Structures are given as C-alpha cells and as structure tokens.
Design a protein around this ligand. Structure first.
Ligand SMILES: C[As](C)(=O)[O-]
Ligand SMILES: C[As](C)(=O)[O-]
Ligand SMILES: [Zn+2]
Ligand SMILES: [Zn+2]
Ligand SMILES: [Zn+2]
Ligand SMILES: [Zn+2]
Length: 76
C-alpha cells in the first residue's frame, strides 16, 4: 500500500519507460528487461564484461519494479 508502489511513482516509471521507448502492449517482464538492456549497452558494456553485467542486472531489476506496477505481465 505504502509510497513504494502507488500510481504516481508507477506513472513516473511508465512515462520514463515509454520515453526511452522500451515499453510495449501485452509485454512480459523478461521482454522489457531485454529492451532496457539493449538501449543500455554502449561503449562501457561492450568493452567491460563487469559493466555489461551491471547493465543486464539493473535492466532486469527495473523490469521487476515495472511488473509490480502492473506495467508488464509475469513470464509464462
Ligand atoms: C494507456 As496505454 C498507451 O499505456 O495502453
Ligand atoms: C497496462 As499498459 C502499460 O499496456 O497501459
Ligand atoms: Zn495499455
Ligand atoms: Zn550480475
Ligand atoms: Zn526478475
Ligand atoms: Zn499504460
């Protein structure tokens, strides 16, 4: 219930995700994570495995925040 996952924050989130253009209709947690990671990888990820990982890690976790907001469906 608390100001962790309300509609405002989730709105800011949903906004931000459509902004960077990775959100989609009927989308699954995993599909988004992979899209966020795509737009995340550049020099630093492609040149450093450890940052390449950090990317996938945060990309994955961000989709989790996104799932709790009802923005994406759980993987099936
Ligand atoms: C209201 As909509 C464009 O996030 O399906
Ligand atoms: C529930 As939606 C992110 O398709 O408007
Ligand atoms: Zn929709
Ligand atoms: Zn990791
Ligand atoms: Zn997950
Ligand atoms: Zn929406």
């Amino acid at each position: 219930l608390s100001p962790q996952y309300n509609w405002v924050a989730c709105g800011i989130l949903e906004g931000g995700l459509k902004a960077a253009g990775v959100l989609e209709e009927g989308q699954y947690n995993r599909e988004l994570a992979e899209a966020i990671a795509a737009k995340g990888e550049g020099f630093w990820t492609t040149q450093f495995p450890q940052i390449g990982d950090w990317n996938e890690d945060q990309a994955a976790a961000l989709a989790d925040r996104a799932q709790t907001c009802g923005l994406v469906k759980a993987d099936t």
